[PDB]
mmCIF file of C-alpha atoms in Angstrom:
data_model
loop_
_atom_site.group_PDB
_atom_site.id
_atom_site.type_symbol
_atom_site.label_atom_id
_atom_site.label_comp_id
_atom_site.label_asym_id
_atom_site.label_seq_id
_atom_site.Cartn_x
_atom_site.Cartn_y
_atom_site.Cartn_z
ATOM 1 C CA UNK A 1 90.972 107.376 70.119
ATOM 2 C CA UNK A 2 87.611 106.604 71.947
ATOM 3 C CA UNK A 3 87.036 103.904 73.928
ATOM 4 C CA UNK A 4 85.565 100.304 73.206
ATOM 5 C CA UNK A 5 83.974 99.599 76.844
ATOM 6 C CA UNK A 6 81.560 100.584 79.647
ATOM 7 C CA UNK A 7 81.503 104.485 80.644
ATOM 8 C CA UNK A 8 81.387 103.654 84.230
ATOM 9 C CA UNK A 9 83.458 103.053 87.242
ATOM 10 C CA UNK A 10 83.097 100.204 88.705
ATOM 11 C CA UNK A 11 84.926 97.817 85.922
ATOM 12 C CA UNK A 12 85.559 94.258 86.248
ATOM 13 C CA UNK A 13 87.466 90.804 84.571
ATOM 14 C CA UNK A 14 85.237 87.589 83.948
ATOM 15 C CA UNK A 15 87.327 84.155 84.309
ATOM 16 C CA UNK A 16 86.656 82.230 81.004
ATOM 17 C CA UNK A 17 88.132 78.677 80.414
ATOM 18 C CA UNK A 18 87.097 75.151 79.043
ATOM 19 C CA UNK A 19 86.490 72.648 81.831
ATOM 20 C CA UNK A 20 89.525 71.369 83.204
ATOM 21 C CA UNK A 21 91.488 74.345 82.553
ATOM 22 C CA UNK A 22 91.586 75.256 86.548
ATOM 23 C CA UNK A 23 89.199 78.358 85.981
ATOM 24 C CA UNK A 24 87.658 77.741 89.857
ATOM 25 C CA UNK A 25 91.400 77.010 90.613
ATOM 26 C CA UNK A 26 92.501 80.242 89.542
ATOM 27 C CA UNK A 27 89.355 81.615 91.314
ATOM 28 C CA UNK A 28 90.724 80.315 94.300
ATOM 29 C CA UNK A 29 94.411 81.933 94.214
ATOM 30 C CA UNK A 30 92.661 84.981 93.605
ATOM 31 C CA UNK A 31 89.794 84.613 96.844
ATOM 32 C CA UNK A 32 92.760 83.580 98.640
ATOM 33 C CA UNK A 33 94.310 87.133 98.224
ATOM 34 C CA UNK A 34 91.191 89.058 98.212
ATOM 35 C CA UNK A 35 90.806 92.126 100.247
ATOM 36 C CA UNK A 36 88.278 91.065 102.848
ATOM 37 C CA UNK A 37 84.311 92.778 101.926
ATOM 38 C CA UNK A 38 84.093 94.101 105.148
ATOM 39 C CA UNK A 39 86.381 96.907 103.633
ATOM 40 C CA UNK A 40 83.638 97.899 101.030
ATOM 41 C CA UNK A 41 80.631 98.706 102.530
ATOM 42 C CA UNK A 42 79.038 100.203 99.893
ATOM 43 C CA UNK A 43 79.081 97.276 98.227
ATOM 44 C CA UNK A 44 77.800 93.584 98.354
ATOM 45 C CA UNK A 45 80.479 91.137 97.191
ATOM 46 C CA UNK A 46 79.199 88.341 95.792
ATOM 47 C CA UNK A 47 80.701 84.532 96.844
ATOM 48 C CA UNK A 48 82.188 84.699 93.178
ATOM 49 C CA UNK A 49 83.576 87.881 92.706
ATOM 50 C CA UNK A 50 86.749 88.990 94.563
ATOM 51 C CA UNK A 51 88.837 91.950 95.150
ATOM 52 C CA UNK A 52 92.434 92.272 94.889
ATOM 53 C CA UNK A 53 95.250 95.064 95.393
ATOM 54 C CA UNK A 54 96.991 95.934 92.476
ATOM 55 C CA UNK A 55 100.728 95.726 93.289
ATOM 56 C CA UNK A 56 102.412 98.891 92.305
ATOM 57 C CA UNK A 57 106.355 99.556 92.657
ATOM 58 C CA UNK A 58 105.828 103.566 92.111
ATOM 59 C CA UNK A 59 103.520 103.261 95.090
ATOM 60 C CA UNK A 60 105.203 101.634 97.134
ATOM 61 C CA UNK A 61 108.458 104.328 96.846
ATOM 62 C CA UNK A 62 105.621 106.800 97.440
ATOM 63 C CA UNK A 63 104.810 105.564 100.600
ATOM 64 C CA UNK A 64 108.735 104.861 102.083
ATOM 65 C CA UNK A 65 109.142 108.903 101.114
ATOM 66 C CA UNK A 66 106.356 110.167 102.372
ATOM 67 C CA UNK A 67 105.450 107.839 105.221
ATOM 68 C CA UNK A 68 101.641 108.575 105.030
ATOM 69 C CA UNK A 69 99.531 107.830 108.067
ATOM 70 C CA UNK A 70 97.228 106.218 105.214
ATOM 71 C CA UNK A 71 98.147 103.892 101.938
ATOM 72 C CA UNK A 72 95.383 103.130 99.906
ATOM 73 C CA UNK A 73 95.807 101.278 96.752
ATOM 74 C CA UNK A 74 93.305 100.313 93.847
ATOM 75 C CA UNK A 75 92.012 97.210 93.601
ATOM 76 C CA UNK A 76 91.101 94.725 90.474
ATOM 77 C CA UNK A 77 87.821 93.090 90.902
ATOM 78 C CA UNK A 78 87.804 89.699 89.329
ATOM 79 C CA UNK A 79 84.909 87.610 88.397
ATOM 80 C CA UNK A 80 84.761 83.252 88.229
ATOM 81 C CA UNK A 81 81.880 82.813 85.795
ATOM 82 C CA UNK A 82 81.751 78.976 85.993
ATOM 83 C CA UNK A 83 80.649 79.077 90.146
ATOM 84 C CA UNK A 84 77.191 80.673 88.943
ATOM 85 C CA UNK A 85 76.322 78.201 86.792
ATOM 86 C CA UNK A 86 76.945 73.988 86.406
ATOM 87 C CA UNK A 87 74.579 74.210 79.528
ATOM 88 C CA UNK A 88 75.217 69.707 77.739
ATOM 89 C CA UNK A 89 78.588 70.034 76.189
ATOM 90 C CA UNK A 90 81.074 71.239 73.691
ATOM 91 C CA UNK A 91 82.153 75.267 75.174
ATOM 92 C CA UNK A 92 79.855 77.446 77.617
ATOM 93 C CA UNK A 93 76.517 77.650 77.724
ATOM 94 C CA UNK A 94 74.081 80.181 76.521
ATOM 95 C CA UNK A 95 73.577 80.934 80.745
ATOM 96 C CA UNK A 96 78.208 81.402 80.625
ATOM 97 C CA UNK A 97 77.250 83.849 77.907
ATOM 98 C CA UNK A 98 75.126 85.822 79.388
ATOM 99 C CA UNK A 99 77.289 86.664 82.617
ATOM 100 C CA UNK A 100 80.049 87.461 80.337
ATOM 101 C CA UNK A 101 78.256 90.477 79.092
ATOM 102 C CA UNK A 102 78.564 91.827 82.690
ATOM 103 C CA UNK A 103 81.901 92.090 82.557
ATOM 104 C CA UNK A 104 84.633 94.742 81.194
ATOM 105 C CA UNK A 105 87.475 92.177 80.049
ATOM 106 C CA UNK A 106 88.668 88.272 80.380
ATOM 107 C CA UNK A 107 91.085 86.457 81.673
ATOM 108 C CA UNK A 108 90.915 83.578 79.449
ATOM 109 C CA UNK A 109 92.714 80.393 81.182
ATOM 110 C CA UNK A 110 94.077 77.940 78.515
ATOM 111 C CA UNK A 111 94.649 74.241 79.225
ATOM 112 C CA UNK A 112 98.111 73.814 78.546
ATOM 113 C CA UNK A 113 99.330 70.394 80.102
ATOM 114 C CA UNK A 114 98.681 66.654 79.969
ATOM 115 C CA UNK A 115 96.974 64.100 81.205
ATOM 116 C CA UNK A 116 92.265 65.380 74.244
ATOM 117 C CA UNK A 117 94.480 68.365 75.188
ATOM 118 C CA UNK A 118 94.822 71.269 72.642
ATOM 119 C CA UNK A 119 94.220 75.032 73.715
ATOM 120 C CA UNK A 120 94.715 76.266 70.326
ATOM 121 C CA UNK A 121 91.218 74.154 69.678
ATOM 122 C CA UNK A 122 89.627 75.539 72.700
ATOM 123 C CA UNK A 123 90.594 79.174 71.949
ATOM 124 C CA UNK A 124 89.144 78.610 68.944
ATOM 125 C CA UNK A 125 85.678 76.927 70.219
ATOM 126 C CA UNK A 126 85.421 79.621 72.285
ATOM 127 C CA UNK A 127 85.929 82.391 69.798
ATOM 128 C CA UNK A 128 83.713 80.833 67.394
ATOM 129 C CA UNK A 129 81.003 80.542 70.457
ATOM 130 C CA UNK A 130 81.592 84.284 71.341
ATOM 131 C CA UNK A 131 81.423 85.560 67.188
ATOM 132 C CA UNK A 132 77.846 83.460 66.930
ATOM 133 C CA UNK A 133 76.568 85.082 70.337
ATOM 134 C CA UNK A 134 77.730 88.238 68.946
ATOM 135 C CA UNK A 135 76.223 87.666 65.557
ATOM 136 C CA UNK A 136 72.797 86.663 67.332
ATOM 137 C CA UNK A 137 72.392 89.809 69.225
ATOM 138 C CA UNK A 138 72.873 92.179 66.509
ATOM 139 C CA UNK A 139 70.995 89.865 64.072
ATOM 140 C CA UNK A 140 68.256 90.464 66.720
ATOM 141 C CA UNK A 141 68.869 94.610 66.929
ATOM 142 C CA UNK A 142 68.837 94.341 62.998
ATOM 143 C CA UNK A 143 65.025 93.011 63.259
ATOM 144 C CA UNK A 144 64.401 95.497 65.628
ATOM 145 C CA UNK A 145 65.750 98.427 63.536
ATOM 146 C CA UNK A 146 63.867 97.725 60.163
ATOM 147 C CA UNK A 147 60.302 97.100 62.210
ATOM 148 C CA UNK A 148 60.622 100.636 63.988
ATOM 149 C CA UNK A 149 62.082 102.189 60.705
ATOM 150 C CA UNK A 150 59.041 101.057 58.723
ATOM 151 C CA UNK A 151 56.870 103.197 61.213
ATOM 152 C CA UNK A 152 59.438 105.896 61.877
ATOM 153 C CA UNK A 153 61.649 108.353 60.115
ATOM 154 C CA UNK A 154 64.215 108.662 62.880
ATOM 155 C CA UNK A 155 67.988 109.912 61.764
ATOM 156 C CA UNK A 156 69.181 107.155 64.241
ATOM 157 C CA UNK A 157 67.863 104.190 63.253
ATOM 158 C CA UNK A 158 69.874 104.397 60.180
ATOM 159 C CA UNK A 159 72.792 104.791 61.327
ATOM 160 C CA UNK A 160 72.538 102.149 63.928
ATOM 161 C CA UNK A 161 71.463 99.784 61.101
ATOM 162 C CA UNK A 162 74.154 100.832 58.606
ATOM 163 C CA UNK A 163 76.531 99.830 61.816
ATOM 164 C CA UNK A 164 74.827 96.387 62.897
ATOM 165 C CA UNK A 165 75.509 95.502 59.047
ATOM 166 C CA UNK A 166 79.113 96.266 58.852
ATOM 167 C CA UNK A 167 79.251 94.535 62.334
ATOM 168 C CA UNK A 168 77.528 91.553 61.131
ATOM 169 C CA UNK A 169 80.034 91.073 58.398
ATOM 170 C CA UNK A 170 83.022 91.648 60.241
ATOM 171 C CA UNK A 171 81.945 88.939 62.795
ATOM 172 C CA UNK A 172 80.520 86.331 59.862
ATOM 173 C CA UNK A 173 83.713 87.026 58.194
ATOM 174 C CA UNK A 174 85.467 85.251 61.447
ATOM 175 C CA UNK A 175 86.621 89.051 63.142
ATOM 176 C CA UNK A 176 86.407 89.988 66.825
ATOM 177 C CA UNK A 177 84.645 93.163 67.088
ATOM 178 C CA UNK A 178 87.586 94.729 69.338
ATOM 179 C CA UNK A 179 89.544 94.509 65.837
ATOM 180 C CA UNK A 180 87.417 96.349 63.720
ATOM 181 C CA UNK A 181 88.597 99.281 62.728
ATOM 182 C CA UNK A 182 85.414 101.640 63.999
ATOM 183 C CA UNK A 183 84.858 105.468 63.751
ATOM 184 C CA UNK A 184 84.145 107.640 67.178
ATOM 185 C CA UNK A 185 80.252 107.316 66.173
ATOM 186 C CA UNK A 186 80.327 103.766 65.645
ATOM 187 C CA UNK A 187 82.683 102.774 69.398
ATOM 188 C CA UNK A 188 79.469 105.190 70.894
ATOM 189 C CA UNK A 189 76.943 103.129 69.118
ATOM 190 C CA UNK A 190 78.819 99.515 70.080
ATOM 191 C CA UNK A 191 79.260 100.710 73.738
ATOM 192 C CA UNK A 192 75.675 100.783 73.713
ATOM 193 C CA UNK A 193 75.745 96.633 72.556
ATOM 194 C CA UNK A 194 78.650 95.941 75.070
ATOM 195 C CA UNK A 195 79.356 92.972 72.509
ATOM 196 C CA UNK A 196 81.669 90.264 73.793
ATOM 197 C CA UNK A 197 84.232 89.723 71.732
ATOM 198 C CA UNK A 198 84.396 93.757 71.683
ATOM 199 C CA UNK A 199 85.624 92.577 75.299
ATOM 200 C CA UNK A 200 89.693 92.760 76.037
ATOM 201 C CA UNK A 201 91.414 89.651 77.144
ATOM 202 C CA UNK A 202 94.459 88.572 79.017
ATOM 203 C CA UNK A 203 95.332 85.217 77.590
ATOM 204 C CA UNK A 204 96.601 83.145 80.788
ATOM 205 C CA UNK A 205 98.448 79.882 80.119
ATOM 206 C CA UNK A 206 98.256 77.128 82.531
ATOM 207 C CA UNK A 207 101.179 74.566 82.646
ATOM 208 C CA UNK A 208 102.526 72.047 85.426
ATOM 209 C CA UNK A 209 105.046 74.062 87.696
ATOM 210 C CA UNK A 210 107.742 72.536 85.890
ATOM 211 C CA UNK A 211 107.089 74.074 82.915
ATOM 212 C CA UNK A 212 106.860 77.177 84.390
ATOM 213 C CA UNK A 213 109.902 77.335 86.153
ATOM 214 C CA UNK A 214 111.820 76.208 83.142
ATOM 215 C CA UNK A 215 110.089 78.752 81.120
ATOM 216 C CA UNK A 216 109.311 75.855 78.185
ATOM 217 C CA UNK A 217 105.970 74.865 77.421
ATOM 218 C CA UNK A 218 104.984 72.389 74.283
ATOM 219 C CA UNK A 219 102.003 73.991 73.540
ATOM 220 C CA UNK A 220 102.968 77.623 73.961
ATOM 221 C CA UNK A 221 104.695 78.407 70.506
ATOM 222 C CA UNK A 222 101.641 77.168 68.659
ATOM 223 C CA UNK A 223 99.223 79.318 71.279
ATOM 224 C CA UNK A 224 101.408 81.779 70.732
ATOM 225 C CA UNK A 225 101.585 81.415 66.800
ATOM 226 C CA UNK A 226 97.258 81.735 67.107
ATOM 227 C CA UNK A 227 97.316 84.752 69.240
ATOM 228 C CA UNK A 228 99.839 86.888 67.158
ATOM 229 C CA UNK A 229 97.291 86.167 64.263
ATOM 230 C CA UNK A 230 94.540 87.086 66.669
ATOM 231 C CA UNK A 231 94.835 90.533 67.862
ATOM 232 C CA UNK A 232 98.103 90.068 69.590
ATOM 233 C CA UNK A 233 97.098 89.915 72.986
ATOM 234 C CA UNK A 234 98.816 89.544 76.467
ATOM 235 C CA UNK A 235 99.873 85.904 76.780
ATOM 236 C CA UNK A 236 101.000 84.846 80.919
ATOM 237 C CA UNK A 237 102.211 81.766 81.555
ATOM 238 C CA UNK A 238 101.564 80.636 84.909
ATOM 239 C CA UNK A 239 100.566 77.067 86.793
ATOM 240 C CA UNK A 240 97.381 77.262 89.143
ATOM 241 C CA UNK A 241 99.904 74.442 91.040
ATOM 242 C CA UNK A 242 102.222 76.498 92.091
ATOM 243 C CA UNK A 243 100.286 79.556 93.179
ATOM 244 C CA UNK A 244 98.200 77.545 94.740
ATOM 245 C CA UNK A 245 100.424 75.947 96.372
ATOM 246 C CA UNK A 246 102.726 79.150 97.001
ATOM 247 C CA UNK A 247 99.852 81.056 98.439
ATOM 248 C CA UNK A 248 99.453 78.687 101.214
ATOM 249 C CA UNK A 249 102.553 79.376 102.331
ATOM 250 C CA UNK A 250 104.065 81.894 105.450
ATOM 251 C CA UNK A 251 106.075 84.580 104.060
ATOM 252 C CA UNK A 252 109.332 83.232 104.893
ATOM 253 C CA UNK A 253 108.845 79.728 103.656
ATOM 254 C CA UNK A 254 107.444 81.084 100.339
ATOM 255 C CA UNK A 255 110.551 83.214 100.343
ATOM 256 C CA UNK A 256 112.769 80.104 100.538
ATOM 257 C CA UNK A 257 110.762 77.964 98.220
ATOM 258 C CA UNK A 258 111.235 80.825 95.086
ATOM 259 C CA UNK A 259 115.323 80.930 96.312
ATOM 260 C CA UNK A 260 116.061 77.312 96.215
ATOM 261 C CA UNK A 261 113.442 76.683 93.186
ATOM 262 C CA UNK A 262 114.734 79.830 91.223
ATOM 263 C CA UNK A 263 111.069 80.490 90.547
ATOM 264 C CA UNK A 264 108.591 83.574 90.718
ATOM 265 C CA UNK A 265 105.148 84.454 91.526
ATOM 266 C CA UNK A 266 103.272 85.614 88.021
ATOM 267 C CA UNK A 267 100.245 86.834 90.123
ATOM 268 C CA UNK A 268 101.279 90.209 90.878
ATOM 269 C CA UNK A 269 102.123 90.720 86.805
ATOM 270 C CA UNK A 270 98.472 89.146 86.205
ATOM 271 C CA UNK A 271 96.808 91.384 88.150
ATOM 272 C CA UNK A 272 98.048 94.577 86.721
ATOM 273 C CA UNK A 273 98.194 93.170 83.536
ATOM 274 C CA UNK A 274 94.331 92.698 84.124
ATOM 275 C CA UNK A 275 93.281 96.422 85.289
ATOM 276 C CA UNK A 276 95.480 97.813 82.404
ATOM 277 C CA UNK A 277 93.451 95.962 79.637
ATOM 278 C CA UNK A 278 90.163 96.813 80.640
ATOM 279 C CA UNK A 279 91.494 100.442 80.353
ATOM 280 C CA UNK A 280 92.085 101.165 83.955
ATOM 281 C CA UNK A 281 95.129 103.629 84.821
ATOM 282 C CA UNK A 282 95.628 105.857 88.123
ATOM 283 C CA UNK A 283 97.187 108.463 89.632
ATOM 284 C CA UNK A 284 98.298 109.500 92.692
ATOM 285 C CA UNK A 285 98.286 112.016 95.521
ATOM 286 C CA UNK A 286 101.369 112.023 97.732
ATOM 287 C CA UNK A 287 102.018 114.012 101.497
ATOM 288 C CA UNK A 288 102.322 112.922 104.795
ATOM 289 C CA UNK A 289 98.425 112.332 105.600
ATOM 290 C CA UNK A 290 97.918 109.751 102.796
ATOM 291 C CA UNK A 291 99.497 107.994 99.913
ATOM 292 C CA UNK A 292 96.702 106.981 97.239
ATOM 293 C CA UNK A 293 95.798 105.528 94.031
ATOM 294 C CA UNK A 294 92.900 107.338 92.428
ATOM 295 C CA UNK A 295 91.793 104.921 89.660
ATOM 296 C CA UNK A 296 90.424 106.407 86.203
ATOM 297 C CA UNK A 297 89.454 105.095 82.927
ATOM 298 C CA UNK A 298 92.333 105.779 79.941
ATOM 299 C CA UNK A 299 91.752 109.380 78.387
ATOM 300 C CA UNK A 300 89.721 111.246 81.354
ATOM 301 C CA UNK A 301 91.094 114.661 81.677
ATOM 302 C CA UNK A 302 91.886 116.264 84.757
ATOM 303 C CA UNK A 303 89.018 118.077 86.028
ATOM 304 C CA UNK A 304 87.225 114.819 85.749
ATOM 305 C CA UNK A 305 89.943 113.042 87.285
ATOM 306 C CA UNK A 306 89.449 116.094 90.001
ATOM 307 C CA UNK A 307 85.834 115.024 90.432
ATOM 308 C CA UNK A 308 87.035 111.293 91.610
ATOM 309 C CA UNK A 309 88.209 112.938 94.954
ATOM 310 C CA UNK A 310 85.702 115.608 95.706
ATOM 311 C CA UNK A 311 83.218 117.177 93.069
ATOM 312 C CA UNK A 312 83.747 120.966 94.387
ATOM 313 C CA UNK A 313 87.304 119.927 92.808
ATOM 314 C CA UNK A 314 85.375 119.657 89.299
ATOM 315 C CA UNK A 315 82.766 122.229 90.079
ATOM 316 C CA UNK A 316 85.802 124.700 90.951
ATOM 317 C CA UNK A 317 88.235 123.610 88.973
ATOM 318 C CA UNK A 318 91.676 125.942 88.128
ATOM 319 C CA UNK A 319 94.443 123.747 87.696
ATOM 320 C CA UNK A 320 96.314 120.583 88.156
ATOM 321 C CA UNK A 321 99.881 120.637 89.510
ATOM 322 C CA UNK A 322 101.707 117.698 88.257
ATOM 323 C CA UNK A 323 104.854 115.960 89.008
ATOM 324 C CA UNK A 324 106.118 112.337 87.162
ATOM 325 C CA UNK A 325 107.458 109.845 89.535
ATOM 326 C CA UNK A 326 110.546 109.727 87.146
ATOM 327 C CA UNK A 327 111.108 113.653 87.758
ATOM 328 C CA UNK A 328 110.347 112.971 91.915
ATOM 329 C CA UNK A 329 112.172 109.779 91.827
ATOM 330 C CA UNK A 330 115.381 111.460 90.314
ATOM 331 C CA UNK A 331 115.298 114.608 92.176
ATOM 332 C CA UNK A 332 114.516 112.974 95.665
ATOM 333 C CA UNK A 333 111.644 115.789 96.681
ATOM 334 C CA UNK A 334 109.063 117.889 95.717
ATOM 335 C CA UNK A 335 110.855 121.340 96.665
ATOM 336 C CA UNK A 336 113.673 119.980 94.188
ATOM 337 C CA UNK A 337 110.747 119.546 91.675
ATOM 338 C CA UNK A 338 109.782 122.897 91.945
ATOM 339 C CA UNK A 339 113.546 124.332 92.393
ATOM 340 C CA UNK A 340 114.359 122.398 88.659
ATOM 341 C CA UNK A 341 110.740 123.825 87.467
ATOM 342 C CA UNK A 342 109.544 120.538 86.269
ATOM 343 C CA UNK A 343 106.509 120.693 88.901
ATOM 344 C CA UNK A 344 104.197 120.890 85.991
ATOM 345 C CA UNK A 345 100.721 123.504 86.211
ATOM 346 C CA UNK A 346 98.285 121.618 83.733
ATOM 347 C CA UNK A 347 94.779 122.503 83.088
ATOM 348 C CA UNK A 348 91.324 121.159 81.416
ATOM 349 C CA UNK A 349 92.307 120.104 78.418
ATOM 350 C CA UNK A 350 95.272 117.684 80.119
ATOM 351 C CA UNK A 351 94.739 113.786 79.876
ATOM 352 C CA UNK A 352 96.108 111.919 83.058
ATOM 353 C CA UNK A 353 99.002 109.857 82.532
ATOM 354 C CA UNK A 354 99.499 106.707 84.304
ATOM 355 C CA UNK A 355 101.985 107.386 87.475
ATOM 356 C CA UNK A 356 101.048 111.274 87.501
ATOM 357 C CA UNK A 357 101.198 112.846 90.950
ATOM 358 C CA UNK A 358 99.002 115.230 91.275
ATOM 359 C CA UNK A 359 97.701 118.266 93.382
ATOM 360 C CA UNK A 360 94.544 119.968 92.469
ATOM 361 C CA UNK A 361 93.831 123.634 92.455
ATOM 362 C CA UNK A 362 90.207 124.891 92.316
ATOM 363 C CA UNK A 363 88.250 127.654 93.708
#
């Protein structure tokens, strides 16, 4: 059950792509839509890093019901890797490499239209460049182990060692560390190495818009065919073309364009494909003063997730009062929650679910 990632919150998704593969083109879309840094002061965004709303249906019915004097939504921050640096040829550099470490998951963009062209070689290039990184580093924390455990008798050390080995042959033997199959003790240890290929990714295919609207793509069945034998990850179609071209667009005329092009925005699916595989979920709260999103990793239970809003929520924590959007959706209210008793009481030991509305009870 544990999970393979940063404890922390303040997660984000690394762009990763072969030159040529629109990875600063993708960036773009994505700065395009950004939410503008003068609503983060606590932070400094960088010139390649960008925030973006995560689109949210649930939400959205949240805030027609309630009509809250304040929406607030989460946000996926996304990462172009390639604007830092511009390594001789042949995949990333060792400077790419080291960026990626920084991040919680990847968008990997694929090449998938013509004019060599062949993503299936480039997802393996980069796999094989990510495995040897991999392989370096804990070749590396391997020296380090057996010099301290030569002058020390620490419990640790062995352990750690015993795990660097098994990792090393999982990752010679051509495995991404994500797929081992790891004990709680060893996903502690590893979150320690933040490994990348123990990194989640969101395989996104770019094609010419024409493939895209007519849903048919030469190279996809074969990418496909190497994915399903990789881990089985997300594959998204989408063309940088189009979105690019779709984003630049008023409302109105973009409106028209999908209409009499029978054709769809994929960003909106990207995005929330993107904060779900680096483990993100959240839940809301729901009245008149405000509509929110309170983003959590997978797994925290609730007097954590009670801590997110306002520590004394933690510190005095009773209960959480819980209500599914189905159950809300269905019923049309909360009092009709309550009336058909399916306004939930939870307590410490309850793990947040995705879409949970919730009101806390402490003190």
């Amino acid at each position: 059950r544990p999970i393979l990632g940063r404890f922390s919150s303040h997660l984000k998704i690394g762009i990763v792509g072969l030159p040529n593969v629109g990875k600063s083109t993708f960036f773009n879309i994505v700065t395009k839509l950004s939410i503008p840094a003068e609503n983060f002061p606590f932070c400094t965004i960088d010139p390649n890093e960008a925030r973006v709303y995560v689109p949210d249906e649930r939400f959205d019915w949240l805030c027609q019901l309630y009509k809250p004097k304040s929406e607030v939504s989460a946000y996926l921050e996304i990462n172009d890797i390639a604007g830092l640096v511009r390594h001789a040829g042949e995949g990333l550099g060792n400077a790419f490499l080291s960026h990626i470490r920084a991040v919680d998951g990847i968008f990997h963009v694929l090449r998938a239209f013509e004019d060599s062209v062949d993503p299936v070689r480039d997802l393996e290039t980069i796999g094989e460049e990510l495995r040897l990184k991999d392989i370096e580093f804990v070749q590396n924390k391997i020296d380090d182990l057996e010099k301290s455990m030569k002058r020390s008798n620490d419990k640790q050390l062995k352990l750690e060692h015993e795990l660097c080995e098994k990792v090393k042959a999982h990752l010679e033997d051509g495995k991404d560390v994500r797929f081992g199959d790891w004990k709680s003790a060893d996903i502690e240890i590893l979150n320690t190495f933040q490994l990348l290929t123990a990194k989640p990714v969101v395989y996104l295919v770019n094609m010419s818009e024409k493939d895209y609207q007519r849903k048919k793509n030469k190279f996809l069945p074969k990418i496909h065919a190497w994915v399903q034998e990789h881990g089985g990850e997300t594959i998204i179609p989408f063309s940088c073309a189009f979105e690019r071209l779709l984003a630049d667009m008023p409302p109105d005329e973009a409106a028209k364009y999908c209409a009499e092009n029978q054709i769809a925005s994929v960003i909106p699916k990207i995005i929330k494909t993107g904060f779900a595989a680096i483990h993100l979920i959240y839940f809301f709260t729901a009245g008149p003063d405000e509509v929110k999103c309170w983003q959590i990793r997978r797994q925290t239970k609730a007097p954590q997730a009670a801590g997110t809003i306002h520590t004394d929520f933690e510190r005095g924590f009773i209960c959480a009062e819980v209500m599914k959007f189905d159950d809300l959706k269905e019923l049309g209210s909360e009092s009709a929650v309550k009336a058909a008793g399916k306004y939930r009481q939870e307590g410490k030991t309850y793990v947040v679910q995705d879409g949970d509305i919730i009101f806390f009870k402490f003190n």
